[PDB]
Amino acid sequence: PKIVVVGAVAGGATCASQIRRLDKESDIIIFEKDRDMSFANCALPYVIGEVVEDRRYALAYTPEKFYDRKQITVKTYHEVIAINDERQTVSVLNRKTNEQFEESYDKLILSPGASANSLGFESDITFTLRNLEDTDAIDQFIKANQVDKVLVVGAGYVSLEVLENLYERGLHPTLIHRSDKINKLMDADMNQPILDELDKREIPYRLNEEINAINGNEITFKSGKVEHYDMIIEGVGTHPNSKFIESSNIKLDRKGFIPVNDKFETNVPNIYAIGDIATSHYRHVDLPASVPLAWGAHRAASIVAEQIAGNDTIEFKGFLGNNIVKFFDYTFASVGVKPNELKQFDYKMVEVTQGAHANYYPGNSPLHLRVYYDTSNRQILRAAAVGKEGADKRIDVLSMAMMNQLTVDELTEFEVAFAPPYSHPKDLINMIGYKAK
Amino acid sequence: PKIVVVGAVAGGATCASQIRRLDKESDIIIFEKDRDMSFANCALPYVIGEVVEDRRYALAYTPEKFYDRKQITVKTYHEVIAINDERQTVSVLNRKTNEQFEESYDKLILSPGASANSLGFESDITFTLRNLEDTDAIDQFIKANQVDKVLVVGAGYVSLEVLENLYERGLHPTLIHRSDKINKLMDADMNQPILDELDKREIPYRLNEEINAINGNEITFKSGKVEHYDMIIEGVGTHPNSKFIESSNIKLDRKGFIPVNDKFETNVPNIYAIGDIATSHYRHVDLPASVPLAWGAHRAASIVAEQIAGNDTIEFKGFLGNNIVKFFDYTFASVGVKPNELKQFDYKMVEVTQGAHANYYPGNSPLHLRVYYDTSNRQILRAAAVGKEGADKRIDVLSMAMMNQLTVDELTEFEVAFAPPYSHPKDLINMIGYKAK
Ligand SMILES: Cc1cc2nc3c(=O)[nH]c(=O)nc-3n(C[C@H](O)[C@H](O)[C@H](O)COP(=O)(O)OP(=O)(O)OC[C@H]3O[C@@H](n4cnc5c(N)ncnc54)[C@H](O)[C@@H]3O)c2cc1C
Ligand SMILES: Cc1cc2nc3c(=O)[nH]c(=O)nc-3n(C[C@H](O)[C@H](O)[C@H](O)COP(=O)(O)OP(=O)(O)OC[C@H]3O[C@@H](n4cnc5c(N)ncnc54)[C@H](O)[C@@H]3O)c2cc1C
Ligand SMILES: *SCCNC(=O)CCNC(=O)[C@H](O)C(C)(C)COP(=O)(O)OP(=O)(O)OC[C@H]1O[C@@H](n2cnc3c(N)ncnc32)[C@H](O)[C@@H]1OP(=O)(O)O
Ligand SMILES: *SCCNC(=O)CCNC(=O)[C@H](O)C(C)(C)COP(=O)(O)OP(=O)(O)OC[C@H]1O[C@@H](n2cnc3c(N)ncnc32)[C@H](O)[C@@H]1OP(=O)(O)O
Ligand SMILES: [Cl-]
Ligand SMILES: [Cl-]
Ligand SMILES: [Cl-]
Ligand SMILES: [Cl-]
Ligand SMILES: [Cl-]
Ligand SMILES: [Cl-]
Numbered sequence A, B: 001p002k003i004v005v006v007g008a009v010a011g012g013a014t015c016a017s018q019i020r021r022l023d024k025e026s027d028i029i030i031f032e033k034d035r036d037m038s039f040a041n042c043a044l045p046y047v048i049g050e051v052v053e054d055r056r057y058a059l060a061y062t063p064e065k066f067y068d069r070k071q072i073t074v075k076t077y078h079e080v081i082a083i084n085d086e087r088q089t090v091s092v093l094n095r096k097t098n099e100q101f102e103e104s105y106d107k108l109i110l111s112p113g114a115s116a117n118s119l120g121f122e123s124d125i126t127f128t129l130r131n132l133e134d135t136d137a138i139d140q141f142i143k144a145n146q147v148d149k150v151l152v153v154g155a156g157y158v159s160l161e162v163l164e165n166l167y168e169r170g171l172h173p174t175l176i177h178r179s180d181k182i183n184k185l186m187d188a189d190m191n192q193p194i195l196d197e198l199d200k201r202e203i204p205y206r207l208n209e210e211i212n213a214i215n216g217n218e219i220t221f222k223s224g225k226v227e228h229y230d231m232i233i234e235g236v237g238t239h240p241n242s243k244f245i246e247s248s249n250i251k252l253d254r255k256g257f258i259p260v261n262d263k264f265e266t267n268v269p270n271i272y273a274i275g276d277i278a279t280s281h282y283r284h285v286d287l288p289a290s291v292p293l294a295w296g297a298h299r300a301a302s303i304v305a306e307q308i309a310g311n312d313t314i315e316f317k318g319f320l321g322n323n324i325v326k327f328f329d330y331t332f333a334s335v336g337v338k339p340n341e342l343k344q345f346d347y348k349m350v351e352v353t354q355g356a357h358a359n360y361y362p363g364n365s366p367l368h369l370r371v372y373y374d375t376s377n378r379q380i381l382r383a384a385a386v387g388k389e390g391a392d393k394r395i396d397v398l399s400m401a402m403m404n405q406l407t408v409d410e411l412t413e414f415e416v417a418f419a420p421p422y423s424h425p426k427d428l429i430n431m432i433g434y435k436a437k
């Protein structure tokens, strides 16, 4: 079938590539409104930090290379401006010529993702981060203005990564956030080490703080404070890229996202939606879920490829919401329902704090593992881990446990890989099980 | 009930402690033939390397302290020499006085473990490593003789750990092994990094090599080579400590181990066996399994405690054989049936080598993950991982998968925790699933 994809990055380029694996005959075209396809979204903070020097690392493909290797046509600087779903075409604006045309499809795959929110100030020193163009712009501005003092707005995991990278690059960031709910996917009390790490490096932060006014480099804050900053990076949330979809028959939710079934189909025949734009449900509980992360974009890309060109009995089973961020010396990982969603269950909490590995083995550090379970059926609802070592390992194991609706009690049976550098004969995970009675 | 335990270490002392958690009234006595109870078996190589220098990490308790804390009586230098099961007593030799006596029991728990094999040479410079007495003897010999050149015999995980530790201590070890089958718990073609790490540090080794003759410090080898060594550490396997059991009605297998049911019961009423001495079955396949490692000793200890003084519905579900060793910069981990046992199945192998984390992200290292599955039911039979980073994480996740009867194909559904320092949007585990078929 003739395949049209909207968006040429984590969901879109991946999905097109996965289709080509199964189908070498069908014509596949991707439209991308911006300059670059297949940029490494998750690499961008590290590019800013000069942790990733080789820009070859930030871009996986050019349209020419993508066609040479995969025979997939990608048109950059081409923005889909409408979906004419009944005639099965899309309206495309060629941004270089400002001329529009229609492209027909047999199957349409929407992976337009999300755009950065802006505070809306009239300021030449303020930047958001979403693609490689933005990264280039930030880097250029730092060099052109010899930026030192930088205001980082927002305490979400990406903004935190940006802050760390600015610090390591040698700049002097200050963090502000409009509330005290930093790194919001993690349990609030377990986020303390973020503040500790800031304090340790004398990186200033202010929570429940906001920009009031901007006058050149002079920033006035809600608190009444006035500070001079060379640059501002705003990480104040994102919004779905769905304005071009509203005139079509596709059903959007009140927030502008696209609900999909387990085949990643929209309500309209022959149109799929994947990635950040799509909403689904949890795997382990009967609740809606939105998990705008890379794993889900890649998984959906594969499922849609099977739907279109492979085994059409392959369907999504829902999200667990596994997520993770590194901040300086610490790892913060969680999986399952969000903190605010626990209230929809009758639940209990079990936790342990123990060395990541054998206490006598050097380089040890305390790992805090927390598990919530449903009192009606003993099933694990949520797990969270914070520490310098071992948090990703425990949370990945628990993700696998939840995938199978494992109970908290059965954690006593988990057979860990033990040698002194790695764990304990009764691992932290085992101890959760022993302590659950 | 009056409880007698044989062996006061990983299985025995742990089990006694777990019983006391549940039962404060029963008399509990442990007989230990050697000097120390509760020594840290797994720490011993690191004590030798002077990595672990605090004595308090080398053993947890003296009998006096154990009694003060838990009211459990432990008699060291007391060797059980016979089990008189028809009269419900054991015969015990007080090794200090050289007098024997009978001790009655209502329940008997056997955790005698295994002893190190010896090459049988008459050599004052040769040592084996099994307990803290051995560790002290090795340390003292090194200092008393200004040991520099050490011959390490055997290439199993214990020997490898001892070699690394002798090197870090500043000594000069040479490794020999009778064959090329080093680190046998790992796939034979995945062990090359062991040899690479030896070469990189110019630590000599010879495979297909054996001690032929010893004359003082002059060692003559199978290869015909003649070398002088200050010390020899022999790691040439272990044998079950079961000779004292043979005259009793307890059923032993032909290799000298004790088969037990899922309650860790022997064939004889009121007698349990746990730890290295015990044989059971795999959890995921219908085959016999023996896994002489700490996790199993500890899990069996808990189950036996529940059987005697707690919830007797709690039963073992079998072994997976999860195991791991560090050697210099590398980790070698595996789980499931042994390579030699794969032939009992119709199976296929799938593998991937990929960076442990995001390719553009620094400090990366290639991680090799291999998975064997049963073609009859797509179930996972064995997994193995080798790399500087991430191998323990992948194998623990796969251990949890096998616990849950996951098919290889369902690995595509594993929701990993992804950010650049930790993994990929399609993790190695996911790629195993995609590559299967
Ligand atoms: C700085 C940063 C760090 C991140 N770090 C992590 C992380 O550590 N872990 C994690 O799991 N996730 C991380 N993410 C999230 C991640 O990148 C997304 O979940 C993923 O990219 C979603 O895939 P997508 O295809 O939905 O959106 P994208 O990858 O953002 O691709 C959407 C594309 O569609 C294009 N587009 C939109 N509308 C149109 C149109 N009308 N016509 C043509 N093209 C259009 C856009 O320009 C864009 O290029 C990070 C994101 C950012 C920005
Ligand atoms: C150097 C070394 C490193 C190791 N590293 C690891 C590792 O990294 N990971 C891992 O999972 N495992 C490791 N192990 C394995 C581990 O220690 C065993 O699996 C565990 O100790 C088994 O517990 P057990 O109670 O069966 O035997 P043990 O812990 O060895 O205790 C058995 C005790 O019974 C006593 N005994 C025997 N017969 C009698 C008798 N007739 N009367 C009285 N007492 C008796 C013995 O003297 C001994 O003290 C290591 C072992 C060694 C020696
Ligand atoms: S923010 C974090 C996530 N963001 C993004 O992913 C950024 C943009 N991503 C993309 O544009 C695509 O994901 C690109 C980079 C184009 C890759 O697309 P694919 O996921 O489809 O992978 P490739 O085709 O480039 O192949 C790479 C290696 O993986 C193997 N492989 C992919 N898919 C499969 C399946 N379904 N089954 C078996 N193997 C598969 C490839 O064969 C290949 O192996 P190599 O030995 O490296 O060639
Ligand atoms: S070779 C690898 C393993 N090494 C060996 O096992 C060496 C020999 N080990 C032993 O001799 C025993 O294991 C000793 C050290 C004597 C004690 O065994 P336990 O496993 O029972 O540990 P403790 O009794 O000293 O208790 C310590 C902490 O763990 C908590 N805890 C133990 N058991 C449970 C259960 N069943 N349920 C909930 N919690 C449990 C304790 O409460 C305790 O916590 P603290 O921080 O000390 O208050
Ligand atoms: Cl990326
Ligand atoms: Cl239309
Ligand atoms: Cl729907
Ligand atoms: Cl230990
Ligand atoms: Cl008898
Ligand atoms: Cl590969």
Ligand SMILES: [Mg+2]
Residues within 6 Å of the ligand: B084
């Ligand atoms: Mg007799």
Ligand SMILES: [Mg+2]
Residues within 6 Å of the ligand: B353, B354
């Ligand atoms: Mg490769």
